[model samples]
Target: GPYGHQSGAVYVGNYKVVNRHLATHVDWQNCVWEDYNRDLLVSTTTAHGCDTIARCQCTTGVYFCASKSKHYPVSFEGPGLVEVQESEYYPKRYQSHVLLATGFSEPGDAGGILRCEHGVIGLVTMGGEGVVGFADVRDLLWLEDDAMEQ
Candidate 1:
């Protein structure tokens, strides 16, 4: 499959960067998480990719059923530049340019790309007590093109 065994990926320049946590952990979860481990899973497809990634300031957010399931919807709680424990791997509890939202995600959903009315917001990472977290796309400058290539 274009997607890895169980994890998900966003196509960067000439590569498909799979989420590190999903590739290792296997347990399905979603939030705004960054791949701090640099696991590159490239080019199984060359679909007409992304436009650009914008800051998520809109009041609404959605993940279009990316965990092979229903689309999760949530409200924007806020954005930050502090350490947050949203991954089972990497950092353990750190990283800035984070975003937190309030909502309910499906049980087995992992690595869903989060979206807001503005544009690509972040990569879905983790959730708890009704608050899910993801990485702010603006901070992910490591990506070749910087847009969340669909």
Candidate 2:
């Protein structure tokens, strides 16, 4: 269920969470600037969308994206990354979060966790744009077979 609030992703219009029951439904919420307190946080400088930001720290092969839909998320890497992407939502205006570590990869690392001061928020998945890329928890909650690869 989406937390009760009007948000930036809301600006993009509502998206449906696919359900097996055919009747069960959840609105798709973008995790672009989703928030939480943790060691690190990644976000975008351009609030209109993620079009301006890129680059991130992720475990190899653990990230995925749909260029056509402009949607992105973690792969089947499971809980480590999945848990983080499932719990945060950022406002559309300020779409960036703090990062804990640059990570083991390089100046940029994908699959790293974004955090607020208190707990984990989003997962760094790529790099570029006005900021870095991440897979927020809202995305994990709506995974579909076609949403991921085998």
Candidate 3:
């Protein structure tokens, strides 16, 4: 598995990314579970700055299920900067990115804080060499709102 552990809990939901007045939304159908330390998992859009918009989801639950899972909302007051890394083991297979104020969960410990300028949500996985994941806050607001409406 790209991520360290093959077995753990997972969550399913949608994510949105809002940059200033421009907002983009997408379906996060199967994102890997990172941490529950906070209220949600943080990931990037997809590729590192590939597109302003990214899609993500989890496998913990069904999409059409009556009780669909919900995503947490993130807000970036202004344009934010993110740092990305390519997987050494995977070699551009599953690159991960990080945002400011995001938290990462470890195996035993609760998690650590990613102090930055903004926030996002995605998933994290471990592979033969190291770990990979992404984050963007916009993904959560819309998803959470839609879930609440239903």
Candidate 4:
């Protein structure tokens, strides 16, 4: 338990220096969600308790299935952070970089901002890419409510 019970904080000087504990907030949730409408959970995973839906089942604008559980609210002040990668893989679009949190988190972390050199990024979602990623706070909150009912 690196972060223990305290919230994490980071000082973005030049390079991305995230405290070890900052990665704690990332966890498995229900689904991913479209960035525009927080209410709609996109089709992504079934591990966290999401029902699989066809890509076409999602509305034309739906993006991904959002997770239901989130350790923190979506903001720059918490473990919720994501790296935006504009790649040729995604033409004219940016991709999200989530945070990792299981079996690798440390102490003195939690509310730290996940970001690069530009500024504060999204909150930590879970551990992936051999590192970390972020979940949408709005989606996380919504999923939590949904999970409770189920």
Candidate 5:
């Protein structure tokens, strides 16, 4: 059987999920800074088309990216390595990452979040071949005014 469908990968624009908010249709529950594993709550969203950002105090955590168009979305290995590795592809951009195994894969899933029940660990930067990679959303943090790790 031929399998295929259509979904999004990355945005050409500056689509970010700062603090506790994001701008995608990923049902990305609570957008916390998934580093400490404990969590540090803050502001929310303002994505491309779905421009919306109301401030307050709350909590929600992302687990993984929803199916690109499938049933059970791929879950990650146990709390990935906090250690970073060299990206075989984008040398500088990928910076550091958690090299782990997967229950599944994707490029559309690349843009997906590798998170826990309390925060976002990182964004899907790699994973196609046998090897898997996900960059730290920590270093990827641009401005500090909108994050917890600041």
Candidate 6:
């Protein structure tokens, strides 16, 4: 269920937890922005209609674009966490840190939050079992400035 729409240009949208542990469906509202200071951008929905592949949403300014639909190889480095080599598309600035106990199952959905010692790193775009693709918070926040310019 969508968290309803926010009046502001930026909306975080809504998320629903499923199977007692999975944050299944996500609906990112409308509008977009960027944070120039951070050099991040909240991507807008360019194409209409849903496909097997996931689409990036602008809610919260985080953007997760799926370059590959398949899950990335991952290792459970420790409790409540996992690690992966930086993907070719993943932003270079972010650490390869990912959360395992997100209460939403492994390989989470888009808009799913990824937390670390510094707090939320970004939102998950793809994954299942024990892998994920995410948008770093720095990349997300950086979108504000970019949107304003265009």
* lDDT leader: 1
Better of 3 and 4 by lDDT: 4
Q: Report the C-alpha lDDT of model 5 over 48-124, residue by residue, as the tens digit.
A: 42222212112222324344433323344433334323344432322233434454334333334444333345445
The weakest ten consecutive residues by lDDT in model 6 span 15-24
Regions of model 6 farther than 4 Å from truth: 1-30, 34-111, 142-150
The numbered model that scores best in TM-score is 1
For candidate 6, the lDDT comes to 0.31
lDDT of 6 by residue, 60-138 (tens): 2222223333333222221222243434343333233233323234433443343342233444533445444443443
Score residue 100 of candidate 4 by CA lDDT.
40
Give the whole-model CA lDDT for all candidates, comma-separated: 0.50, 0.28, 0.26, 0.28, 0.35, 0.31
Tens digit of per-residue lDDT, candidate 2, span 1-150: 877332122111122211111112122132233223322222222223211111222333222122222222222222332112322332232232322222232333332333332222344443432234543433332221212221
- Residues 6-65 of candidate 4 have per-residue lDDT tens digits of 233222111122222222223113223344211112333233531211111111111111
Across residues 20-136, which tens digit of lDDT does each residue of candidate 3 receive?
111113322332223222224433343332112123322121111111122322222211332333333323332223332222332111122211222223322222221223233
Off by over 4 Å in 1: 1-7, 12-52, 64-68, 82-92, 104-111, 141-150
Q: Give the clashing residue pairs of candidate 5, or none.
A: 30-60, 30-61, 34-120
Error of 5 at 67 (Å): 6.0
Q: Which ranges of candidate 4 are over 4 A from the true structure?
A: 1-33, 36-78, 86-88, 91-98, 101-129, 136-140, 143-150
Which residue window of length 10 is worst by lDDT in model 5? Answer: 51-60
Candidate 1, residues 24-98, lDDT tens digits: the string is 332123222334522212233344444345543666777644444656666765555445554555444654555
- lDDT of model 3 at residue 26? 30
TM-score of 2: 0.21
**Off by more than 4 A, model 2:** 1-106, 138-150
Would you estimate the TM-scores of all the predictions?
Answer: 0.54, 0.21, 0.23, 0.22, 0.34, 0.27
lDDT of 6 at 110: 44
Tell me how far the alpha carbon of residue 120 in candidate 2 is from the true structure, in angstroms, after superposition.
1.5
